């Protein structure tokens, strides 16, 4: 499969006026490992983080299109885009390419700066949104991420407990996956601050 | 999978990893990929796990009957032959195997490679499996005949380690065995992540 | 998916289950499958979610211009027709399947639209993977000039057949009720699968995960 | 390739009902509308199947003969549970030779005041339960019988008949290769009996089915 | 993967090397094709793959860079921009009618301050690319069947502070390992170095 | 599907079953396969419902335009030719078998068959759909020219019912419409008043003797009804 | 096919077919083996010197492989069969195990061929 | 027509110093349907200390269970009435699966039992019989999420002894989560706790949808 | 092919067309598809002629042996079961649809259908071959129980003729045979005395108006017969 | 055809040579496998192809010849009989269940008078064979991808009256040409000579 060629996984969870998003650091060509220092997270503005997985040429190209449109948005509109409009926009671009797709699967995580309400979205490769309240994930160890989060996640959590949940998840899931791994990077976002952490993991 | 072996002045080293990977999902990190056939011969296992374990167990049953019938230990030449002839006869039946056989009989250390088609080759240095293409890189720089036992165990450990670091389907614990005149000896097991910190 | 619709004496009831799946895993337990088309027309969707979303949105936008232009209320037939033209053009590549229901000056209207572009106006319909199970509740239980309450009980029972017998459908019933004068969404009308064993809480004391490196940024 | 459609069955307090229609098809052709598809096997047991009628005939012959011979040569009367077990072994064996029995069986019976009902599919899968079905029965009927059995303390004979008929009516409405003509067998008091064919009442007269409302072009 | 290429970056240079071989099926046509193409005064690219995609591709890069330098008074473009340009063209071709360039590249540059106003971090950069448009900065990288052997040696022996002489020895050993273990014959390597003073051929590496 | 049209003196009758199916499962049991093209021209649709709905809609759009221009009622041959051309231009992309029939003052009642491939044939009766292959012999044996409107409605209802009793892919209601110089007359017969089914036909009442009891004689009598 | 039981016990633990086979050995010409330090000597008696017998006489000491000889006494034709089986066996062994068969191994193969002929119906 | 069907569902086991706990769900799935919510064929007892647990195709697990049940009866007759230990049955089972190399059982199996020292063990097999002895194991539809969770809670490799009761609660939690997310796993779980004393069993409800 | 058998009180009638074809071209126009299995048991063969000739020959060989052993005439059910088993054991290797019918003193006239796949069904009438699908409705509409021998021969001849007039793969003679307690009666009707064909049916005499002349009116009248 | 073999016959000898290489896909496992197998005191066979068919095949020839020599008081079999035997087995296997041996062979012998009664023409014979069972006497012959290059050189340079020294030079040049032009690496050759006095390795040919 083509969505698994390059490797990688991403996960985002919500808490109470916070989220965490994590990605692994591996880039590959099927089983051959090219780099161990490629995190898949992109910061859009103070409020929005983008995760992309799938084929790396299309992650690289589709994030450059997102960046381009965002810059023009900011000059026309003289403001930052909100999490929900950014996701609707992303969706529109994936579906523009409905009969010849970008092989990416995005994970968007955001927070309304005013109301402190957290918006999560994940998309299939033609832009169908899946917007639950607990978590989202994508990439080569998404099956194994589901059950980690169903058993560790709980409503209400604050930044530091949400960070442990979300790091134990990513590590235990990457460790049963041959195409994602080499530890992780996590962004933790509140209305007030954005913390980043590089987490240690296995060297296989 | 990664396995290597080579022959030097003090005997033979075998080293392996312990991961079993469908291709995406990792089923185990604790496979024992060296097979103690008996107490003077070792196999290694690469390719299909069920195939290698059934046929080396069969091999071990023939090495034992030989020794009941003849009152003496079978040679490494003949052991590898029994196994090459089984693989040869199954050539058309889809087995998947890449084995080393190693022993120290009366003519000294012998290392063979034997595969699912019936190949059987004797030589002084081999590496088998998906990560072989990285192990040979490190192993060809460091290998020579007059290594000490400690230097040779380090060379093999560092070689498997470098394969686990770069190959998706190799990983886990690195195990090194030494085949000497007296039989064989498991020398070490070290998790490859703990080795990362030793070598950085 | 299990979507259902019925006509009753003064309007339409649409129903849906709420599980969305990727593969054989539940991605979202409480997804919303009943979509706005106009003040007096809603749509439930099955098929490929992206396609069902794109076409409904598009026709809902085009119906809105048409109401600003005409200054009249949207007709259910107009929606049905814009839907079918679009799906016909794409030869089922756009694989949306829809139950459409509304009420306009000519009374209640309920129809299905398949992905190749065929339509069928009928007094009761089902679609999606649990369509068969659902449809067996509807044929035993529909009658003419049902009251609102009977209609709601029939739609919910039809969705629950899907929920418990089709593996791709699950969680709860959402209804939508449409009448000459209002549209009323009813998320979680029926929740037949609540928790039993309250979850074991598993805790990680902060500082459980080893961090190599940290950076902070004040907003 | 005479083939039978749906079969359904349900347990009630005191016994079990099996039902099907009397039709063999060939593809879309309704070829024989007057075939009795249910077969009595021994003293306590009755079977039916969806699928290839030739494979059903062959398999029930083989079974009925084992059962009758065993009884006649001093080895007693096989029970539903035993018949069922033997069936599943033979289905499985044939699958294992790549010469399958292309049928799906439903088996019913009553021995020791305990009613049996179970299913066997063409690769050898078997299960017992309070309601079993084959064909479009599994998609159309089971949701109704299962809803019916939710009531606590189980079903009376009459409530089991009513719900069997509602399922029949839906099959007749939504299953292409069917007809409005059905039989019911009833296992109870350690014996099976097969009823005469009957028909169910259907509805066709809703206002939403009229010509003007279903017209594609006004 | 019949043509191995190799590159690594050290504190004050990049070494690049590529196998000379040009083949027609099993026949060796020649073993001295230079595949390490200079793009500008402080850039090279080693491409792997067929003559035709490979030449057409690097000629298109060269001409577009040359056109960017006169429409800009001869100002040297940064290595990271040349890589971004290369990447967009590999990616574009991949969704085009005529289809992808089947070339795999290693781009090596040394960035040097345009003017005094220029705040640029001055030094060597290496970029791995693939025919799909994957692109990644790296401290070393390779393509072709010899790639795995060399990558592991370099994981084992490469450090950032190698002197120019040690890094030639290491480049030499990586070429020998390719010869020893790859069945396709990569018998002769051409190796160039990219430094603050520009591109220069390394003669002792064969 | 089973569709048909029949000419009588002064008009036509069109008839159809009411079933839409996915092969094995009925998705609509009350379709309307008699589609209006102009006041006195209808077609009977068979094949893909998506295709024949789109071509009928298109044919109707063209004829309404033409009638406004001309200011005259449209002749059947015009309907038939417009449709035919649509069926011919798209022959590789659709599955459609059509019957156009109608009344017009110039040529009276007329019937055109337009089968798959897009030919167009002008007949005294036409059969179509999967269920048609059961009615050729029916019509050869039982149909007559000279029938009145009432004979022809009744005959069509009885043909459809014969077809749909043996065709797995037809069933449900029987709809008809009669077109002539007067007002269009439509009729729908529910399955419970069908003039023929095998379920009610007395030669299929008694069951085949497939399941005789274990006996001491080769004589065959009755099906075993109760356990021994 | 003939399946009669030929070699059977008789009233005191005697297998007569085996005894009479050993009688046949006693009538056969004498053979001797003698093991030195590093040489083995096989010596056999030949029938009787004739003018007519061929000077290049047929050999009654057979090679089984590059390093193993056999001499016998008894029915010479039976022995030729036995020597055939043993030549096959040595080559079979090279093919299955690469190494050359040990004398002690080859002896057990032959001896088991003799034992089986004392128990195999038909023979 | 394939000779192969996957009837779905999940099993899981955990060992500790003198007990093993074994769980399997009770749904039997067809094609886009459910045959029943109360199948108990996934777990099969072989001796008083040894269980077989299987997922995949149910007709295959029923055959394998019978072939094992008669090899085990034959061992007893040939061995003076004794039962083979857990280690022996596990080796027997591997041997037998390999032997259908060429037309294999569509089964993911576990042999689970006490060892000779009184401690639990679990052997997970592939379809042709490669295995090892482990402290925990899982297989089937939900196994790719149950397994990292058990890796996490029991080995704790990315962090800084359990009772029977704590272990039974962990498994109960793991099946509950499996049923929420895996659409082919549900209804109930049958749990057997194996000690030297004997075998305790306990049903446990799960989501019905 | 079109084959059929019908029970009447006291006996059966078997009927068949006479054509053997490669698809498009007739290789034999006078086959005999009514094959004798015993004095009063016959079968009607459809499908591969090579297969059904070999299975009938084999079934006949077995029944003659059985009748010598038993010393009794053989019952129809025996013929039917022997054949059925041959048709079931070889189902993947043949193309055969068979009807066995016969008279015997114990059970009178009986008819078994043995279609492809090797089932065996005991009926009051059976249809088979490609031409069968045109006769279901015929029989549903026109067949009755209680018919005498003479009514049943005549009815069979008329059914075959209806079938073969519409089926490209049937045609030629109509052969029948009547089996009852008396002597076997065979009959062959030549195509020139067939009781039905479309060539002689007056509702198909006048030709469809596909080729009207170039005219100044949309009115349709007659086919153009002569150049202008 | 990854393994080139070469042979030619001159007035009083045959030279045979074969490339040492053993490979696993693109990886060189070793380059010193001797593939020139001695069958008897005055015979060799150079086989080309996979280890497994190749070993099983020549072991079966060796054992059947060995068995023919004791059932015949150690009398040496003629080269043309060994070839006829080899041919019948290649041909037989080709119509068997297990299928053909995928080996290509060159059989070289020097025939020498058994006794005084023996009238045999005494000298060197070379036979080409293929995996199908084609067999043909020849003055020189080859297999593998290097075959065409060498065949033409030998058409150009081979004569019957080459001295032992000239024929080693010619064998050496044929091995160099294979190295120069075949992309698969046949880097090391083992070369043996068959003479009246038997089989002997030729060390100067590498």
Author numbering:
A (entry chain J): 2 to 205
B (entry chain Z): 111 to 310
C (entry chain I): 67 to 285
D (entry chain b): 1 to 218
E (entry chain K), J (entry chain Y): 1 to 206
F (entry chain H), I (entry chain V): 55 to 282
G (entry chain R): 2 to 124
H (entry chain a): 33 to 192, 198 to 246
The article reads:
The proteasome is a multisubunit protease and a key component of the ubiquitin-proteasome system which is essential for the maintenance of intracellular protein homeostasis. The 20S core particle of the proteasome consists of 28 subunits organized into four rings of seven proteins each. The two identical outer α rings limit entry to the central proteolytic barrel made up of two identical adjoining β-rings. Three of the seven β subunits harbor protease activity, β1 (caspase-like, preferential cleavage after acidic amino acids), β2 (trypsin-like, preferential cleavage C terminal to positively charged amino acids) and β5 (chymotrypsin-like, preferential cleavage after hydrophobic amino acids) and are expressed as proenzymes with the active site threonine only released after full assembly of the core particle through an autocatalytic mechanism.
We generated CryoEM structures for the apo forms of both the native T. cruzi proteasome, purified from the parasite, and the recombinant proteasome. The native proteasome structure was determined at 2.31 Å and the recombinant structure at 2.25 Å. While the resolutions of the two electron potential maps are similar, the clarity of the recombinant protein map was considerably superior, particularly for many α subunit regions, allowing accurate protein model building and confident placement of over 1000 water molecules. Excepting the higher quality of the recombinant protein map there are only very limited differences apparent between the two apo structures (RMSD of 6258 aligned residues 0.85 Å). There are three cysteine residues which exhibit differences in the native and recombinant maps. For the native proteasome all three activities were equivalent, whereas the recombinant proteasomes exhibited different rates of turnover for the different substrates, with caspase substrate turnover the fastest. We observed catalytic activity for all three active sites and pharmacological profiling with a range of inhibitors, covering multiple modes of inhibition, returned very comparable results between the native and recombinant T. cruzi proteasomes supporting the use of the recombinant proteasomes for Chagas disease drug discovery efforts. The structures are highly similar, further confirming the suitability of the recombinant proteasome for drug discovery and other studies.
